[PDB]
Design a protein around this ligand. Structure first.
Ligand SMILES: CCCCCCCCCCCCCCCCCC(=O)OC[C@H](COP(=O)([O-])OCC(O)COP(=O)([O-])OC[C@@H](COC(=O)CCCCCCCCCCCCCCCCC)OC(=O)CCCCCCCCCCCCCCCCC)OC(=O)CCCCCCCCCCCCCCCCC
Ligand SMILES: COC1=C(OC)C(=O)C(C/C=C(\C)CC/C=C(\C)CC/C=C(/C)CC/C=C(/C)CC/C=C(\C)CC/C=C(\C)CC/C=C(\C)CC/C=C(\C)CC/C=C(\C)CCC=C(C)C)=C(C)C1=O
Ligand SMILES: CCCCCCCCCCCCCCCCCC(=O)OC[C@H](COP(=O)([O-])OCC[N+](C)(C)C)OC(=O)CCCCCCCCCCCCCCCCC
Ligand SMILES: CCCCCCCCCCCCCCCCCC(=O)OC[C@H](COP(=O)([O-])OCC[N+](C)(C)C)OC(=O)CCCCCCCCCCCCCCCCC
Ligand code: SF4
Lengths: 98, 83, 99, 70, 175, 96, 284, 318, 59, 97, 155, 115
């Protein structure tokens, strides 16, 4: 388990940490969401290439197919929250507190 | 006939691109089943030796498997030369 | 599978990629083909409870082949001890490992 | 007239000709005349590596024919 | 120096990863992702995954383009932030750089890191395997079998993406 | 014209591959000797490099199985030169 | 913590539309150079177009008062940079009407001759600069070679290339230089081809029509009420042309066809301009 | 002998765009009955040098509302991307024999648009943001057709290797088997490089700038030299992909001469259409691709997946 | 258009008031009406057909 | 049949302009190479040529003198260096040199 | 010699300047129409290296063609101040020079000089497209006689 | 090696041209030469407020469609299989849904750009 595995695993942790610390931006939040996807794609690519799991080389592709699909969903949701509330800071949508 | 011919002619006037694209799109699906060279394409792909033809141990009673590459018995693909 | 429709309906949907020793394209074997082949042939129908205790060394060989955890650890010790020994000056690499 | 346009092409055509000629000649010069061997697959690279080891001078392009064995 | 570019490339991947995870302005976040995405493509290329490397390069670039194409569309701030700007982003940024630089120091000085899992520093060149690939690249034939061995995956992926266009319009339509 | 030429290219590739199959036995035959030679050289050097260690019995198979496992490239070239490492691991990938 | 809404809908928040507003000039090359065109847009579709003008408000109407009738003649050449004799013809007719005096028949014929040449001048630049702003830059240069040819006729008769100061109350300054009519005939002989050169690359051009067809469409009564005149009435079905309804000078003797438009959009009026270019040749 | 090779590519490339600006006006002028530059040197053979030297000595200035860092890096992005993209082009023998050369050029060409809006966004100008937002959706929508057109044509290749086009169209030009895809490929190349049926990226008539909004002597020179280099290649890529040429393995000079001639002829056509058509409005150029190019694009794709199968003409993978 | 002049004299040798009818004045006054709904890139097209020379509107 | 005549006509210009050295002189200082009959010479050194076959506008031209009134004009030709008597003929205002 | 080296270097820069003037069209009045005739193929302004270019950030010389009305006078100064400044201003026509016909009006400044420094003055009403070509040629001569490096070497 | 040397040379060449771009031409600047350009008269204050364009729907479908082209990219190597019937059926299947998604996107306003 060489150091490149450490780099991208520790990377995904900061993607997890980055997502879980929304400061003032939904768009920057979605950035960290797609950020997670890099490390998962990159680690998955390293795994099935190292192990010569040739039939499983499709798995990183199918990750990406369902990757941007969420990415489109996030921005489409971001379209209306910014459209009808003006901005994208995740603090002005607290009307559901009650 | 009258309903179909009027529709095709009208679409051929206003939106030539769509009636065009639907044509080649339509032909792209139905000829490949009809055309007889599809089996040749399978045979050409099958006949391509990417891997080694690993020898199989001769314990006798294998008349069809050749003992030498130049032997007559076995899969011969002279049809490729003719085709 | 929770509700195994693949077993009942008798078709394959994902039981072709779940393992490394399946029919890969153009018979390209995986790295640890033999190691997992023994492991699966070891614990087949024996149950997960019995598999985790009986087919244990086969899994350990297979898991090691996947990561080379101990083998790389062995190589790490060879290089480190060689480095300090060469640096101190006891012995020098033989000419075959120079060119 | 229109033929006055051609000097604009000529100084460009010669300039665009250089990369094609330079790369073609550099490969031949740096590989002893023969074209640079292309390895699109590991098997091609395996031949090249065996060529480097066999030649003795650690040059893949330096080739030994029948005279190496006897 | 060319000992093994895997760690160096993955380091820039993490530093670029640190960037947009610190919550900059969204446009600067795209740059922080792109450098990580570009060098991430470099990591996979170095490991033999030639097709997959350029694959994530092309898709992501288009993906993140519409990302920060959107940010300037309706998510822009009238006074945009920057890597320095607010102390929060400044604090979030510098925290990431000092963090990763601590782990790599913790990584390269004993080579027996045991955080969560085990991580021993011996060189990612080692895990490579000796063997030819015939006249075909293994990765290309693996992802080519999607149309022969993965007909089930094609159906679910195709249907989901088709539904993906339905939801996008349906969500964004409104009224 | 494309149909005929592509068929000819397929026939050429068959000839190319058939040529490859002919020399595979030699390349396989020599390479196994080189790999065994490299491992043997590593084992002798490992014995010399560790003789005063507490317990490093020469050449213990980490895998419990007695069959041969295709060796790591690391354990082959590990103590060899830097140029040997780069030309071996990132040789085909970097050859552009 | 206030109670949740009864219909599960909150009142709409503060309006968040900013509607980016800019000034489209006067530096903009396609804004005629003197437009401070400010527009309101719904993001990209314009809502109102407030054309701030006065960026070239030279006090012409006040300066005319202080000059004599002859002294005020050059001002009308400097109102419309392209309609030179047409501008002076209007002022000359006004001064002659007050004076109850008519010009000699030769002077009238020269007026309508150079009046139609002028109509070629404005139409040439109107269409070509329309192509320039649209994006087609090539027909600009071809027909502005001919504009130089007509500029020679302006200079050969009056002395200056653009501001002729030629048409004056009571006729014209001086007679035509000998041999000018031959050059006018020579130039007009090939101008039919040059018009076909212009119109062939745009009239049927798919890009051109899509850039003008069904754009800027005005109705009939809308154009009449808005004070629109000239082509804009002609381009939208209204059959009106002062050259036929209220003939001035000897316009009651020349025969020509007014190109009434049908759709009223940009493309129809541009066609009317091109046809008005061809029709002037018959009048010439 | 690799630094010499690289500098035997960079210098000829920058000199090719250098005098393309002269063969632009000298061709544009002659097509609009003008004469083009013929004063600076004989026949204008020194005008671009006079242009270039001025554009590296007249005062550059960052905008007061600029973002310095992104303002400076955008010219770096444009120029380096343009140069690095010529790398796998298979002039007889390609400089870098990439196994996936086609995918490489697609990826980096999709990156040359980050320069245009990073320049636009950092410039903090109303015309800058408009031009930046015009260009991005312009290129990516034109990119969907770019990817599929390349794939449909290359299905007869059997691989993405650029060198194999030499072998593929050895006897027959590729355009004779994929001319319908050739037409949309040429139009898309006109659109990715922003020439002038769709030069709306600059939008000089309606946006005065947008390629380089406040960009000055140096940075303006880059954003020009980074797109005129794309002009030469996108026709070199068209030439290599569709109009093949005879390539004797012993005398590559004949192929280089032929290859250069096709690029020169194609580049003239890029200049030729530039002065023969009006400007597409934004919705029109988007409508043309999303509503007329794409339906034909997918249909001809399905044709080219099936075509080798029905005719048993699957090309060799190697 | 319909270029015209409202010339007012007083019996002297100079005009008393020379109002200049501007064909483009009413034309440019209607630009907002014609630009209703059309995209901004069509604003150049609907002033190109306008034929507004800016020495007449401004006078 | 006409290309060979064109090259011969183009080759004749080098003999027309006093040899090759004169040809580059006109090319590098007058930007034209067309030859034409010498209609006259003025006192300041300007050489006036005319060629009626050229279309109206280029049928007459002047090659400016190298030096006039203590100011070198080899590379510094000015449009006002024409004497009034020749200015009339040059501007096509009349046909009488 | 150092002076000789600075002499040739100055000439190289001055040649690069005078051989590429990019006017930023301030087309205001009938003076602009005649200037476009200079761009017309009859005189072909482009052939002299001088080609029309918008975006004053990418232009070298101003060509004031037409009357300068007091309302737009701030615009003239603003577009003048935004030029990367090896920069020159050419005034076309009597109106731009000193007011011309509208010298006595209430809303026309008596000359473009009062707003911007003015290089070569082009007289006319309008100056013929050939006269402007002579004017631009005069500016090229003025750029030729610039001793920027010689002055720096002798500071 | 070869690829990174080429990448390095390009960025150094580009950066050097910037360095001589901003340093060789000396500067005599002020606060009015750095003012944002707005075709003359003063800007009203913009270029960073939300500038909402209309092609957002088709901008995001490009991202969806760009994933389709990723899925159908491996086709050149997919033809080199022994079961082209299944490969042909699946290859056309992805194209059909890609066409179907565009067609349904077309019918419901879709490609039309909001006013
Ligand atoms: C990821 C790493 C990001 C690092 C960072 O802080 O970038 C800030 C950097 C600059 O932000 P900015 O909004 O331009 O503000 C610059 C000044 O604060 C505002 O403008 P300025 O005029 O003050 O700019 C000059 C200023 C800032 O320095 C510069 O402008 C020089 C270039 C950037 C240096 C950082 O100089 C100094 O502060 C003194 C330097 C000694 O923003 C970036 O996006 C650059 C990232 C570069 C990443 C690597 C690319 C290869
Ligand atoms: C609407 O539509 C529109 C368009 O179109 C659609 C348009 O077109 C246009 C454009 C307008 C026109 C065409 C109209 C006319 C205008 C013009 C012609 C403008 C002209 C503009 C120019 C930029 C001029 C271009 C002309 C020329 C002659 C350019 C010439 C080039 C050069 C002088 C430079 C050439 C390159 C050189 C010298 C490179 C030198 C390199 C080296 C010495 C080596 C460098 C590298 C190394 C040393 C590597 C080794 C180093 C190492 C390793 C360092 C390591 C370091 C470490 C720290 C490790 C517009 C505006 C438009 O509106
Ligand atoms: C990084 C920096 C690298 C620096 C490299 C060093 C050289 C760079 C610049 C080289 C050329 C500079 C100009 C030198 C000559 C000059 O001033 O010419 C204009 C000057 C301009 O003189 P002028 O000002 O009298 O011209 C205008 C006036 N009329 C038209 C009336 C004449 O002309 C000459 O010097 C004459 C030169 C004739 C030959 C020119 C070259 C012909 C062949 C070209 C082949 C292709 C080359 C590419
Ligand atoms: C490739 C190009 C080869 C030739 C390049 C020559 C150098 C041109 C640099 C730009 C002009 C300035 C220069 O040369 O020196 C700056 C020097 C700087 O010192 P300076 O004091 O003369 O600067 C001008 C005067 N002030 C400071 C008031 C603005 O300026 C000049 O030479 C201009 C006089
Ligand atoms: S000087 Fe004469 S031509 Fe020029 S703008 Fe003034 S009135 Fe018009």
């Amino acid at each position: 388990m060489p150091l490149v595995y450490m780099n991208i695993i520790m990377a995904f942790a900061i993607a997890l940490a980055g997502l879980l610390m929304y400061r003032s931006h939904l768009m920057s939040s979605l950035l960290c969401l797609e950020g997670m996807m890099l490390s998962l794609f990159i680690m998955s690519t390293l795994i099935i290439l190292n192990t010569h799991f040739t039939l499983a080389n499709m798995m990183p592709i199918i990750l990406l197919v369902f990757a941007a699909c969420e990415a489109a969903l996030g921005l489409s949701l971001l379209v209306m929250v910014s459209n009808t509330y003006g901005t994208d800071y995740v603090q002005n949508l607290n009307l559901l507190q009650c | 006939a009258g309903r179909i011919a009027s529709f095709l002619k009208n679409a051929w006037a206003k939106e030539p691109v769509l009636v065009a694209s639907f044509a080649i799109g339509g032909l792209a699906i139905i000829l490949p089943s009809l055309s007889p060279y599809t089996n040749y394409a399978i045979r050409i792909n099958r006949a391509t030796p990417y891997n080694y033809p690993v020898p199989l141990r001769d314990d006798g009673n294998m008349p069809d498997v050749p003992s030498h590459p130049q032997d007559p018995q076995g899969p011969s693909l002279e049809w490729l030369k003719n085709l | 599978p929770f509700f195994d429709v693949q077993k009942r309906l008798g078709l394959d949907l994902d039981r072709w990629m779940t393992i490394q020793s399946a029919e890969q394209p153009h018979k390209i074997p995986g790295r640890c083909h033999a190691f997992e082949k023994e492991w699966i042939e070891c614990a087949h129908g024996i149950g997960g409870i019995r598999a985790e205790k009986e087919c244990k060394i086969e899994f350990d060989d297979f898991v090691e082949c996947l990561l080379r955890q101990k083998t790389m650890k062995r190589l790490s010790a060879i290089k480190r001890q060689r480095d300090k020994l060469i640096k101190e000056g006891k012995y020098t690499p033989p000419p075959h490992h120079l060119g | 007239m229109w033929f006055e346009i051609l000097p604009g092409i000529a100084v460009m055509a010669a300039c665009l000709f250089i990369p094609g000629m330079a790369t073609a000649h550099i490969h031949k010069f740096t590989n002893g005349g023969k074209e640079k061997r292309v390895a699109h697959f590991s098997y091609q690279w395996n031949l090249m590596e065996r060529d480097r080891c066999i030649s003795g001078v650690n040059r893949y392009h330096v080739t030994k024919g029948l005279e190496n064995i006897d | 120096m060319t000992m093994y570019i895997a760690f160096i490339l993955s380091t820039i991947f993490v530093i670029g990863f640190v960037g947009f995870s610190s919550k900059p302005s969204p446009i600067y976040g795209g740059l922080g992702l792109i450098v990580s995405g570009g060098v991430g493509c470099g990591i996979v290329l170095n490991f033999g995954g030639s097709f997959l490397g350029l694959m994530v390069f092309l898709i992501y670039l288009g993906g993140m383009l519409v990302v920060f194409g959107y940010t300037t569309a309706m998510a822009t701030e009238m006074y945009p932030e920057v890597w320095v700007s607010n102390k929060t982003v400044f604090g979030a940024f510098v925290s990431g750089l000092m963090m990763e630089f601590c782990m790599v120091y913790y990584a390269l000085k004993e080579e027996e890191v045991e955080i969560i899992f085990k991580f021993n520093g011996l060189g990612d060149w080692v895990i490579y395997d000796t063997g030819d690939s015939g006249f075909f690249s293994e990765e290309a034939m693996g992802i080519a079998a999607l149309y022969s061995y993965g007909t089930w995956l094609v159906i679910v992926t195709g249907w989901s993406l088709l539904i993906g266009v339905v939801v996008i319009m349906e969500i964004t339509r409104g009224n | 014209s494309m149909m005929k030429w592509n068929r000819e290219r397929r026939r050429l590739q068959i000839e190319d591959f058939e040529a490859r199959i002919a020399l595979m036995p030699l390349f396989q035959a020599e390479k196994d000797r080189r790999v065994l030679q490299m491992l043997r050289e590593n084992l002798e050097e490992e014995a010399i490099i560790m003789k005063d260690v507490p317990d490093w019995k020469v050449g213990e198979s980490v895998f419990h199985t007695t069959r041969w496992v295709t060796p790591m490239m690391g354990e082959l070239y590990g103590l060899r030169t830097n140029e040997e490492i780069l030309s071996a691991t990132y040789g085909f990938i970097w050859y552009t | 913590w206030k109670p949740p809404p009864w219909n599960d809908v909150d009142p709409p928040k503060d309006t968040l539309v900013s509607n980016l507003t800019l000034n489209f000039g006067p530096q903009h090359p396609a804004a005629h150079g003197v437009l401070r065109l400010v527009m309101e847009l719904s993001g990209e579709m314009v809502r109102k177009c407030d054309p701030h003008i006065g960026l070239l408000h030279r006090g012409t109407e006040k300066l005319i008062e202080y000059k004599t009738y002859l002294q005020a003649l050059p001002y009308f050449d400097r109102l419309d940079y392209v309609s030179m004799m047409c501008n002076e013809q209007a002022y000359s007719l006004a001064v002659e009407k007050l004076l109850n005096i008519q010009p000699p028949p030769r002077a009238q014929w020269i007026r309508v001759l150079f009046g139609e040449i002028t109509r070629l001048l404005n139409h040439i630049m109107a269409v070509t600069t329309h192509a320039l702003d649209i994006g087609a830059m090539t027909p600009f240069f071809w027909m502005f070679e001919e504009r130089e040819k007509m500029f020679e006729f302006y200079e050969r008769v009056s002395g200056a290339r653009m501001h002729a100061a030629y048409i004056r109350p009571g006729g014209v300054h001086q007679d035509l230089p000998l041999g000018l009519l031959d050059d006018i005939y020579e130039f007009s002989k090939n101008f039919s081809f040059r018009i076909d050169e212009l119109e062939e690359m745009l009239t049927n051009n798919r890009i051109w029509r899509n850039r003008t067809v069904d754009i800027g469409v005005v109705t009939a009564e809308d154009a009449l009420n808005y004070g629109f005149s000239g082509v804009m009435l002609r381009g939208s079905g209204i059959q009106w042309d002062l050259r036929k309804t209220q003939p001035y000078d000897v316009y009651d003797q020349v025969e020509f066809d007014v190109p009434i438009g049908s759709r009223g959009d940009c493309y129809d009026r541009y066609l009317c301009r091109v046809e008005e270019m061809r029709q002037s040749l018959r009048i010439i | 002998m690799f630094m010499i090779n690289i500098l035997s590519l960079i210098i000829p490339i920058l000199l090719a765009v250098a005098f393309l600006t002269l063969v632009e006006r000298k061709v544009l002028g002659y097509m609009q009955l003008r004469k083009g530059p013929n004063v600076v040197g004989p026949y204008g053979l020194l005008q671009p040098i006079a242009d270039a030297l001025k554009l590296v000595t007249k005062e550059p200035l960052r905008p007061g509302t600029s973002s310095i860092s992104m303002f400076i890096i955008a010219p770096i992005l444009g120029l380096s991307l343009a140069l690095t993209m010529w790398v796998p082009l298979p002039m007889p023998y390609p400089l870098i024999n990439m196994n996936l050369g086609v995918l490489f050029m697609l990826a980096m060409s999709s990156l040359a648009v980050y320069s245009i809006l990073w320049s636009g966004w950092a410039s903090n100008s109303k015309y800058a943001l408009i031009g930046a937002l015009r260009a991005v959706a312009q290129t990516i929508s034109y990119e969907v057709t770019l990817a599929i057109i390349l794939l449909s044509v290359l299905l007869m290749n059997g691989s993405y290797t650029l060198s194999t086009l030499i072998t593929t169209q050895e006897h027959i030009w590729m355009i004779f088997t994929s001319w319908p895809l050739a037409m949309m490929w040429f139009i898309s190349t006109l659109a990715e490089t922003n020439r002038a049926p769709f030069d709306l990226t600059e939008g000089e008539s309606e946006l005065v700038s947008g390629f380089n909004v406040e960009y000055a002597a140096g940075p303006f020179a880059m954003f020009f030299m980074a797109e005129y280099a794309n002009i030469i290649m996108m026709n070199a890529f068209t030439a290599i992909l569709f109009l093949g040429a005879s390539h004797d393995p012993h005398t590559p000079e004949l192929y280089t001469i032929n290859f250069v001639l096709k690029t020169l002829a194609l580049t003239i056509t890029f200049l030729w259409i530039r002065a023969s058509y009006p400007r597409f409005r934004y919705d029109q150029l988007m409508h043309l691709l999303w509503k007329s190019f794409l339906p034909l694009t997918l249909a001809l794709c399905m044709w080219h997946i099936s075509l080798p199968i029905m005719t048993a003409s699957i090309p060799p993978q190697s | 258009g319909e270029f015209g002049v409202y010339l007012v004299s007083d019996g002297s040798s100079r005009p008393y008031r020379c109002k200049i009818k501007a064909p483009g004045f009413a034309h440019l006054a209607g630009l907002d009406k014609m630009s209703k709904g059309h995209m901004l890139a069509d604003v150049v097209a609907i002033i190109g057909t306008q034929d507004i020379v800016f020495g007449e509107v401004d006078r | 049949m006409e290309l060979v005549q064109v090259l011969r006509r183009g080759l004749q210009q080098v003999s027309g302009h006093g040899g090759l050295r004169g040809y580059l002189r006109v090319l590098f200082r007058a930007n034209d190479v067309r030859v034409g009959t010498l209609v006259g010479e003025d006192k300041y050194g300007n050489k006036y040529y005319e060629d009626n076959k050229q279309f109206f506008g280029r049928h007459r031209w002047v090659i400016y003198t190298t030096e006039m009134n203590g100011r070198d004009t080899f590379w510094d030709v000015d449009g006002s260096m024409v004497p009034p008597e020749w200015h009339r003929w040059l501007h096509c205002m009349t046909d009488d040199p | 010699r150092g002076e000789y080296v600075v002499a040739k270097l100055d000439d190289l820069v001055n040649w690069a300047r005078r051989s590429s003037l990019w006017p930023m069209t301030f087309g205001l009045a009938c003076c602009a129409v005649e200037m476009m005739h200079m761009a017309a193929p009859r005189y072909d302004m482009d052939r002299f290296g001088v080609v029309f270019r918008a975006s004053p950030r990418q232009s070298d010389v101003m060509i004031v063609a037409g009357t300068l009305t007091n309302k737009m006078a701030p615009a003239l100064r603003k577009v003048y101040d935004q030029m990367p400044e090896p920069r020159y201003v050419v005034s076309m026509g009597s109106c731009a020079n000193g007011g011309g016909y509208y010298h006595y009006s209430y809303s026309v400044v008596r000359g473009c000089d009062r707003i911007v420094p003015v290089d070569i003055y082009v007289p006319g009403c309008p100056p013929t497209a050939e006269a402007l070509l002579y004017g631009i040629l005069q500016l090229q001569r003025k750029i030729k006689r610039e001793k920027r490096l010689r002055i720096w070497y002798r500071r | 090696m070869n690829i990174m040397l080429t990448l390095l040379t390009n960025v150094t060449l580009a950066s050097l041209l910037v360095l001589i771009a901003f340093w060789l031409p000396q500067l005599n600047a002020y606060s009015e030469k750095t003012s944002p350009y707005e075709c003359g008269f003063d800007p009203m204050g913009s270029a960073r407020l939300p500038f909402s364009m209309k092609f957002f729907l088709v901008a995001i479908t490009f991202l969806l469609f760009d994933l389709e082209i990723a899925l159908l990219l491996p086709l050149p190597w997919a033809s080199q299989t022994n079961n082209l019937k299944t490969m042909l059926t699946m290859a056309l299947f992805l194209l059909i849904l890609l066409a179907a998604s565009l067609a349904y996107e077309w019918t419901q306003k879709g490609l039309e750009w909001a006013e």
